[PDB]
Design a binder for this molecule. Structure first.
Ligand SMILES: *[C@@H]1O[C@H](CO)[C@@H](O[C@H]2O[C@H](C)[C@@H](N[C@H]3C=C(CO)[C@@H](O)[C@H](O)[C@H]3O)[C@H](O)[C@H]2O)[C@H](O)[C@H]1O
Ligand SMILES: OC[C@@H]1C[C@H](O)[C@@H](O)[C@@H](O)O1
Length: 499
């Protein structure tokens, strides 16, 4: 993997502007890629693109393979007469996931019935071909989703045992009885991957690479966990005996208790790591670079007992990261992965990362709270193989962060910036000052959240880790991301050898 010296922008597709309550894979997405090209940007970073449940988090999806039906543009379907679209009164500047849930699912189902009614034979055959091609995960996903309508939205591990345990007759009967519902979920996937593939081709024509993302741990209530319970630490009822998270941090005094099921890595190794090969394969269909959230988990993971309500109780357990990445390398060739190596990082995590040539990350919001700080540009690797951010989707906006920063952080930030020739007068200028610092550094890639380009405060924060609600909702307003913003990004990239 050869990283050129460049910049990019972090913008989850949901945050795009446009009608009907959520950003989608259509014209406004194309406009953003055009904006990015004219700004001199060469990378677009997104978060995981799978279907979300309660909390609306990309990082806890009903499937490790499925695409988010909320990202489906309905306008192309309306043009073909499959559905009539009416705005129910979506807000400006944010996703109302409650109203989106209430309006978009019925609109998708209406489009599916219209499709079965009016679709040309060519479209039906394309849809059927897609299904055959993706059956190895799609049959499980569509039935998993279909079965939730038969059982009050219960998670798979609360379903009647014959279904929970995937008995052959139970499954066969269910697939038959829920044939239409199964087909509708398949249809949402066909549309997602067609629309994404189109958008990927557009990015490629404009010289833009898409950085994707995948959590190390998958979600408890997901189709693949249901299909392969032996791969996870579950009890006889299919419930996790232990769960994922991070220990009592400097940050969180009780930690983060993520709740995800943990892998039986011994079982995965004996099985040949097929889940990981497939995940990476699928990610590489959608993205040019893929980041793995919590990369340190491949070396060792914090195992929290299920009966513990926080992340305080537990232990570190070693994982065969070396074994997995040797296998990936001998089977894919060259690891096109980015390591999310934030948090408590040991020498063993770093050596695993460096052994496989994986670029790590740097976050400038973390750089000013103590000159040996690793997030300060002068401490970055000489080889430059790192991605620098002002903040990620888990951080506040940089203006928001600055407003609550400690006096010592603020003073050291100003001085350190001054050492790099960078000055500012107004606090609203801090996001651009830090973006400038990142671009001046040796990091091959500088990727910035669009909220920092706009210098927005804490209201535009994408995620606040720990809080279960109010997240993943920020959206651009139409025209907010202006030609002048693009020209300023372009000047900065030109001034720092990134164009
Ligand atoms: C890396 O992965 C993180 C873990 O998934 C992700 O975190 C966000 O998404 C989580 C799903 C969300 N909720 C979980 C966290 C808890 C406590 O920390 C539990 O109480 C919930 O039941 C879980 O669902 C996180 O709050 C949220 O930060 C990061 O965004 C990603 O970078
Ligand atoms: O959830 C945000 C971060 C993600 C990261 O992988 C982990 O190390 C911890 O610090 O929390």
């Amino acid at each position: 993997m050869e990283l050129p010296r460049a910049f990019g922008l972090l913008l989850h597709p949901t945050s795009l502007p446009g009608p009907y309550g959520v950003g989608v894979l259509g014209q406004e997405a194309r406009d953003f890629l055009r904006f990015l090209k004219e700004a001199g940007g060469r990378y677009w970073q997104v978060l995981p693109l799978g279907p979300t449940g309660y909390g609306d988090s990309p990082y806890q999806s009903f499937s490790a393979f499925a695409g988010n039906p909320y990202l489906i543009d309905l306008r192309p379907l309306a043009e073909r007469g499959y559905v009539r679209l009416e705005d129910p009164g979506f807000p400006q500047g944010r996703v109302d996931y409650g109203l989106l849930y209430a309006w978009k699912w019925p609109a998708l189902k209406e489009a599916f019935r219209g499709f079965k009614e009016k679709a040309s034979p060519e479209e039906r055959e394309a849809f059927a071909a897609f299904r055959e091609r993706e059956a190895w995960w799609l049959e499980d996903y569509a039935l998993f989703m279909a079965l939730k309508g038969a059982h009050g939205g219960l998670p798979w591990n609360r379903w009647p045992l014959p279904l929970r345990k995937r008995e052959e007759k139970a499954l066969r009967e269910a697939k038959s009885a829920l044939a239409e519902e199964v087909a509708f979920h398949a249809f949402t996937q066909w549309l997602f991957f067609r629309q994404w593939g189109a958008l990927k081709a557009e990015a490629e024509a404009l010289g833009i690479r898409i950085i994707g993302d995948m959590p190390i741990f998958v979600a408890e209530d997901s189709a693949e966990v249901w299909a392969h319970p032996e791969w996870f630490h579950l009890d006889e009822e299919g419930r996790p005996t232990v769960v994922a998270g991070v220990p009592p941090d400097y940050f969180s005094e009780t930690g983060q208790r993520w709740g995800n099921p943990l892998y039986r890595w011994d079982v995965l190794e004996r099985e040949g790591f097929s889940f990981w090969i497939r995940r990476l394969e699928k990610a590489l269909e959608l993205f040019h670079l893929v980041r793995i959230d919590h990369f340190r988990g491949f070396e060792a993971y914090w195992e929290i007992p299920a009966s513990c309500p926080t992340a305080v109780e537990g232990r570190w357990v070693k994982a065969p990261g070396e074994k997995l990445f040797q296998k990936i390398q001998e089977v894919f060739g060259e690891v096109p992965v980015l390591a999310e190596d934030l948090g408590v990082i040991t020498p063993e995590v770093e050596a695993l990362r460096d052994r496989f040539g994986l670029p790590g990350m740097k976050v400038l919001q973390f750089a000013f709270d103590x000159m040996e700080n690793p997030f300060l540009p002068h401490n970055y690797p000489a080889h430059g193989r790192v991605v620098v951010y002002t903040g990620t989707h888990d951080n506040d906006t940089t203006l928001g962060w600055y407003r609550t920063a400690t006096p010592h952080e603020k003073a050291f930030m100003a001085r350190y910036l001054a050492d790099w020739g960078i000055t500012f007068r107004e606090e609203e200028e801090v996001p651009w000052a830090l973006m400038h610092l990142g671009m001046k550094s040796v990091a091959r890639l500088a990727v910035y959240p669009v909220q920092d380009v706009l210098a927005l405060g804490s209201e535009a924060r994408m995620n606040y880790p720990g809080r279960p609600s109010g997240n993943w909702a920020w959206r651009l307003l139409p025209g907010e991301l202006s030609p002048e913003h693009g020209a300023r990004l372009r000047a900065m990239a030109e001034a720092t050898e990134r164009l």
